[PDB]
Symmetry: D2
Subunit: 403 residues, 4 copies
């Protein structure tokens, strides 16, 4: 396939893949994504950093051949860098190794095991295990590798950090850089990526950033080139966002999620929202029947409170909540340093109990559950006024919470 | 709307609603359903048994008018029977009460409170509370009301038209089917019995001990033989009531097939490969397999197949120390259904792929035990299975299938 | 239901409905919408302008009650204004007329017929037919009705135009005004609304705007309060956007749409995109298997070219294209004054013919069809280079077209 | 992957793939399917008949190895048969040729060009072009290749194992079903025949005149009686070949039921009300109705029901002078299927609601005529139907149903 490479610096090209048509990846919704791969042309050696998903290499090979032609160089890769084992970035490694079998493959020790388990044809390939802070000279360009299957690669002379999934966003535009798309789209996508993939590592993000700041390594980063989405020409913008998300900096905002069979829990959810809105607090409303866990958690990330509602069905809450609860148990939002507030609610026709389960699970997920409200069938006008008042009292507590 | 009634016995008509276009109801998938309502014409009085979902009464009113015209009777309803409070059978009650405000409403004591909570305009309506058992005479036809026959729902009743032995069972013995044909014998048996199995699996499973208790009582009392037809609130009318009663007895006592239901989810395909390998092992022993992929399959079809399966396998990869979250929906649903209430603890295996510390399979095993399954083993592997690891899945599936065949029915 | 009204001016409130959970309306996808209704308090009479979808009045009644309480007025509506017959804005009229049966209903002559056909209980209601430029005095506030079944209502003293669907956007936020949400979200939603609902009326928008500019009506508009979405505190921003869309002002951009059974048409679509991108022209890629007609036409609206691809199935193009083609026949993009460029493409296994149908239908929809390309089964490397070259030549022509 | 082969006759095995988790294929909905591949062991040579979709060969290789082991034979393929080029049956050919590069590949002349276009690594493979009625001897078993039997696809052929009368028919007589059971008689007849009807409706309808021509040729010549089993490329194997042959004859000649298929779309619900009212009229005459809502129903199920319906109703509201656009997808699909090729011009009515000038119903009538239907009438109304307008829909449906019952197929 003929496909053009994009120059990102002198002798450095993006040779990635535009996955235009994918709509979901591991339960994360998106309007396409990219698998970013990079080609560094030293005076003596050409290095390929990461690659692409199995079966999607046609674009990558076209861009590699285009870059080599633009550089007046033969079609040859001398060094292969594999920053991560996951197949969205290593899926073409068996093809690359077959075409260039003498090119050493630089990766971590655990990555050698993971890559051969994925791709048995790589058994006996020339792996060069990196045990951190190792560097190689390409001829006027230095690549420093920093580590368990993942690592970052720094092109030292220009300060380009090949950060793999860190600082990535699932976006698929013809534009390659952060500044070429609307800021709201970029930052919303970055927020979704942090919420779904970085939240449980929040304490690690804080610990690592202080080390990097105190050592003086932050100032050596001029560009961040991740494995998905846009390339950051303003690295402090994404670093700042990660710091805010890792420390629990939230808006005066509440995320409400519910499911319903006959509509009563929906009426309650809307009534809680009216109470919250009466205090000038923002609301995001999600209906589990047709909304996505990945968008929900994006909004929980900068919300100070989270309401979850569902009716009772055979003594349990409506089962769609179990998917979100399992996902929240994995994400561990309390790792951000904040225990967001919460309320559990729902309608019932007999013994009830679903709201009691929701309250217990919200506490297990790290939320500070303030109250529960379960009612019988269709809410009366007075019961909807109770939902409003509860939402109003919650919204006052939200505004009093610092940062 | 002009719509014809269907005669089901002398002076008894179906006047229900064909909900042609609904595809899902409380998370239960279906290709339309019906809201079955019935008109019983006595010599002196007419009774309407149940009605329909809010906003769907146009067909019902057309059929009621047609039935009156076929009977040579005035357009009048004397008695309103509510066998349940849920809006799929009581949604038109405010309209019926407004048209016929002196027609008493027969229902249970709790149903009065539930009906007024749904529909405040019914405050002050002429409710007639049925306590345990009560009969009324329509003139040559007797309706006997039986309060909370499965005990669990105090808002429900069965109504028996005694002289012809027609049991108006409400949701009991119902199936979510929408055909122009009204009777059990007018559609393919597999469609009818598959729909009945799905209805039991999703709605009756946790009440299995009560179904058996109620059946033993009815058989020892001699009431079973008075039932000549079962006219439920959804789907087909049973002209062969022992066929559905027999099926309910089998499902309530845990009579299963030499069959395994496998459910999994996957991000990169490794758990899928494992699931297929377990199936190959099971199939090598002549045991049936149903395979479900949680990415796009439905909880309501899954539990239909668990109901007559002797084993259940659940697989998912690990994502941040937990199993892939789609399993949580099915696990919450199984916790509600309580399959152990059938008297059988179906066998189970938990499996999955991992990239680091793993742990998702140990969570699946704990949850399967909480849902009442007898978890025999767990198998978690690293990334893509090797040929030998797929052979271990096959062997595990083969050993499970031998155990499934040795389990007595 | 307890729900607060929002003051938009002295004695003027938004008393609408937040339809939080709707995801589709007449085949138009959205993340909820609103049904905006307005309450105007004259010194002598109170007027309700529009209302809401059947079964969604709970919020509206709560906000009306709240507004009357904030004003120190009794719960009473003296005048009812119905700017449109469609049920998303007239669905509560039977309830409003039942509560206030002596309140006249102001609407156009055709609207009386359509409202009684929807709601037979309104037979005998006190309708007051409007012909155009009719005014009513509420006591210190004047409402001027403009017939344009639909009409605009102007609150003359403050220059507030109640424009019904004109200038609307399908958005559901707690924030009510244009300036309170990200500009990209507002303008993308406005673009989608124009593309799906105003495109075929483009010649009328330009005729009306010229009439309104030549006269002194435009400067009397200080705020545009539509029936969906945000209220425009900057009315020239949306009027300007409507002018651009009605005159065919496009970007150097191409929208590519395709469907595929085995993946060959997808490969072709991606190869055309690579050619287009080599010339610095933007690409939006849609896959009909799971993408939406309403998003597709949003992007066609500011694209200078449109590529449509599909394989042949029993001598016809893959049937999903028929839905988009029927929709484009209704929208009439040539009414913007521009015949956007187009190419038809696809793969076949025998006699083919699907691309010839696509090319004929694109011409019927008003596109300037430049070429067609149909190939046999999987494209070879040379055939993908042909797609690239065709896309490259199209992109040169796109850049030469005067905006 | 370890996976067992299934013996279907002496030295003949199914070695196919269970695609458990697929839900859609080229716009055709299904609950999984299979890619049926077969191994014929003669005394001296083994032949593989078709294979599977790219990336799904793991099961196939396991079953091939298993069948060899069951026969006490080495793991070797001597002859490769490609009854079609399409990748669901040729996707593993590059792997099979790489493992057994001297095994000739029997296929049609066009098929060589199509296979090399899909798979360039097959350039220089040992293709053996078939011209029809050609046979090969495997040692006590004979395979007879029949070029383009349905005529329309020059890439296809049928293979007959002459001694046992097993016809490997590729997609002809196939069904998209995925069960552990392999034969027609091991599953409910309604599931099998409904799946067969769906397969004919979506894939064979436009070839109906060729089906009749081919069958007439086969019957006068007497080759019909040499067919003891039909082993297609998807779904169940026919141990009762006259059952599927009979069904194909009925579908190819336009034998229909007293049945009407109604399809509609709606924005505000008025067209839905009309559709339901037409159905009530039809049902009053004892004629069957299938109702489809284009918002969430599938073209492949719709055309299944059109195939044995004597009439077809299509409704949609007007949106900017055109019918609601979802109808365009169904119309494009019907233009391809050419139901008039069955020899019957099914009756039709176009209907819809409008808010201004209308015109959508006139477009629907023109398109229905282009698709080969006999359009009897059109009915377009303003906004919400009144009770009298719904009575008109009922009466129109009643008159259509009387005409449906008078039609002799
Ligand atoms: C299938 C099903 C099972 C139910 N099981 C229970 C139950 O175990 N306990 C209970 O209190 N209510 C049960 N209900 C009643 C609902 O909880 C009740 O209708 C509630 O008002 C529904 O709220 P919703 O309108 O938000 O769906 C059940 C309802 C359905 C349809
Ligand atoms: C977002 C994400 C989070 C993950 N978290 C973990 C983890 O916490 N522990 C672990 O062992 N593996 C983890 N993995 C790796 C997967 O479990 C691993 O890739 C596995 O092989 C996937 O199985 P599958 O192919 O069935 O999806 C994670 C993978 C992803 C994409
Ligand atoms: C159900 C079906 C019907 C087909 N009909 C035709 C046809 O009428 N004419 C033709 O030339 N090819 C036909 N083909 C072959 C396809 O056009 C061919 O595979 C094409 O390359 C598919 O493109 P895609 O890979 O983009 O789906 C048909 C294929 C299928 C599966
Ligand atoms: C976006 C849109 C465009 C419309 N365009 C037209 C039109 O061009 N001509 C017309 O007669 N009616 C038009 N209508 C009105 C519908 O045809 C009318 O509301 C009809 O009653 C809808 O029927 P349904 O309820 O079955 O959707 C339009 C409606 C909408 C929402
Ligand atoms: Ca340079
Ligand atoms: Ca897309
Ligand atoms: Ca290890
Ligand atoms: Ca349907
Ligand atoms: Ca009487
Ligand atoms: Ca008892
Ligand atoms: Ca851990
Ligand atoms: Ca254990
Ligand atoms: Ca939503
Ligand atoms: Ca008129
Ligand atoms: Ca499935
Ligand atoms: Ca031999
Ligand atoms: Ca011939
Ligand atoms: Ca017109
Ligand atoms: Ca006509
Ligand atoms: Na009421
Ligand atoms: Tb990644
Ligand atoms: Tb029910
Ligand atoms: Tb509107
Ligand atoms: Tb096929």
């Amino acid at each position: 396939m003929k496909a053009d490479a994009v120059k990102i610096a002198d002798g450095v090209y993006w040779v990635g893949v535009l996955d235009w048509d994918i709509r979901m990846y591991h339960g994360y919704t998106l309007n396409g994504t990219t698998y970013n791969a990079y080609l560094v042309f030293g005076d003596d050696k050409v290095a390929l950093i990461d690659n692409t998903y199995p079966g999607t290499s046609a674009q990558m090979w076209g861009r590699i051949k285009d870059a080599c032609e633009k550089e007046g160089r033969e079609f040859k890769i001398d060094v292969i860098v594999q920053n991560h084992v996951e197949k969205d970035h290593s899926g073409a490694l068996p093809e690359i190794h077959k075409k260039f079998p003498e090119a050493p493959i630089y990766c971590t020790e655990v990555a050698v095991e993971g890559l051969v388990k994925h791709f048995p044809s790589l058994k006996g390939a020339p792996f060069k295990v990196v045990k951190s802070l190792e560097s190689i000279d390409l001829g006027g360009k230095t690549l420093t590798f920093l580590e368990p299957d993942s690592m970052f690669t720094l092109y030292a002379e220009e300060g380009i950090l090949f950060s793999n999934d860190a600082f990535g966003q699932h976006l698929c535009f013809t534009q390659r850089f952060d500044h070429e798309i609307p800021e709201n789209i970029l930052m919303d996508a970055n927020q979704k990526f942090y919420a779904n993939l970085i939240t449980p590592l929040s304490k690690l993000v804080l610990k690592k950033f202080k080390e990097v700041i105190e050592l003086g390594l932050l100032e050596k980063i001029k560009m961040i080139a991740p494995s998905h989405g846009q390339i950051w020409t303003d690295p402090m913008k994404v670093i700042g966002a990660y710091q805010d998300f890792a420390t629990g900096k939230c808006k005066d905002k509440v995320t409400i999620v519910y499911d319903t069979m006959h509509g009563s829990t929906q009426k309650m959810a809307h009534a809680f929202a009216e109470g919250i809105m009466s205090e000038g607090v923002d609301v995001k409303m999600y209906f589990l029947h047709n909304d996505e866990r990945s968008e929900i958690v994006k909004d929980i990330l900068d919300s100070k409170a989270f309401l979850l509602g569902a009716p009772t069905i055979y003594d349990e809450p409506f089962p769609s909540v179990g998917d979100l609860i399992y996902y929240l148990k994995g994400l561990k939002f309390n790792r951000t340093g904040l225990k967001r507030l919460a309320l559990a609610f729902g309608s019932m026709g007999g013994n009830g109990g679903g709201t009691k389960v929701l309250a217990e699970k919200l506490k297990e997920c790290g939320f500070e559950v303030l109250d529960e409200y379960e009612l019988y069938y269709v809410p009366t006008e007075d019961e909807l006024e109770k939902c409003y008042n509860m939402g109003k009292r919650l919204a006052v507590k939200v505004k009093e919470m610092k940062t």
